[PDB]
Design a protein around this ligand. Structure first.
Ligand SMILES: Nc1ncnc2c1ncn2[C@@H]1O[C@H](COP(=O)(O)OP(=O)(O)O)[C@@H](O)[C@H]1O
Length: 305
């Protein structure tokens, strides 16, 4: 049990994952199939250990990998390549030998090395990986992720036979992400509305939409933080009272600072279309058609397979 190497029994199913209807498939057949039907792989037909997940930042690849882990009962074992070179460059060769050791002795397991491009002295940490990987049988497979395919070592890449591409969320994908992110939170938003925020957020990534909603969710909390007068909006059927901030002097006004209001009696105001627009506009897309063309090029070349 280390402090830098995450370990756990991931509980994320394909359905908890944005869209990626296809990368999911590829992963199913690349990882699930071989673990489920171990026999189909007799002499010379070896499953492929070492899967590379590459795509624009904010597409949440690690989530998807945990998803693989789950979908094929296996213990997850993450580790941020960034940190392995920054906040931990000292115990580098170690934690690596540790990460693999730990995983190797918890079969079935998935070793998730995020930001693999980060590993490029450091030429001393590239080998420990090679020594491990090109030495990992059928017990533990390595999933590596990167947002920068190109700036990836020519050697390490080669030890990543299969290579799925994780794209930015399409419309259906984004619309869901909004819905997922929001959740049970009281909103006035129709299903169609979400479809719209979906369209309004073209070019956005999972991470971006995340921020968008996380800020939109802060509207009502702000709406009562700056609330002066309230209103008793409870139907003759409600048990406890429902006091929700109201405008100036509406057909129900009544000056009161949220400070003086019962727990059971507070009624959070429903999310508004405006609420998301404000939040949408407040945020700009992280990627760009430039730092997104190299992806395609990569998916085109990606020779040393
Ligand atoms: N479908 C999704 N559901 C929840 N969060 C998501 C989803 N898609 C992307 N994310 C976001 O992705 C972020 C992680 O992106 P990340 O996995 O670090 O990219 P990478 O794998 O290349 O490092 C998380 O903080 C999460 O909020």
């Amino acid at each position: 049990l280390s402090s830098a190497i995450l370990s756990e029994k991931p509980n994320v199913k394909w359905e908890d994952v944005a869209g990626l209807e296809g990368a999911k498939e590829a992963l199913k057949e690349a990882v699930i199939l071989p673990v489920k039907f171990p026999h189909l792989f007799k002499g010379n037909r070896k499953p492929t250990s070492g899967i590379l997940l590459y795509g624009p930042p904010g597409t949440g690849k690690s989530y998807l990998a945990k998803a693989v882990a789950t979908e094929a009962n296996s213990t997850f074992f993450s580790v941020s390549s960034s940190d392995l070179v920054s906040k931990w460059m000292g115990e580098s060769e170690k934690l690596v030998k540790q990460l693999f050791a730990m995983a190797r002795e918890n079969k079935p397991s998935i070793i998730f090395i995020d930001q693999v491009d980060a590993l490029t002295a450091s030429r001393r940490i590239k080998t420990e990986l090679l020594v491990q990987m090109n030495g990992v049988s059928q017990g533990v497979l390595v999933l590596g992720a990167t947002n920068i395919p190109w700036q990836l070592d020519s050697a390490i890449r080669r030890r990543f036979e299969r290579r799925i591409y994780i794209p930015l969320p399409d419309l259906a994908a984004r619309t869901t992400m909004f819905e997922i992110n929001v959740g049970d939170t009281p909103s006035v938003l129709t299903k169609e509305d979400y479809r719209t925020l979906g369209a309004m957020t073209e070019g956005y990534s999972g991470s971006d939409i995340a921020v968008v909603v996380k800020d939109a969710l802060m509207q009502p909390i702000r709406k009562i933080q700056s609330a002066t007068h309230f209103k008793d909006v409870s139907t003759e059927d409600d048990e406890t009272r429902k006091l929700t901030p109201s405008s100036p002097g509406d057909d129900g006004a009544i000056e009161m600072s949220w400070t003086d209001i019962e727990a059971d009696e507070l009624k959070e105001p429903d999310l508004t279309i405006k609420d998301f627009l404000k939040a949408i506009k407040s945020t700009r897309p992280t990627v760009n058609e430039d730092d997104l063309l190299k992806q395609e090029q990569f998916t085109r070349d990606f020779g040393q397979e």
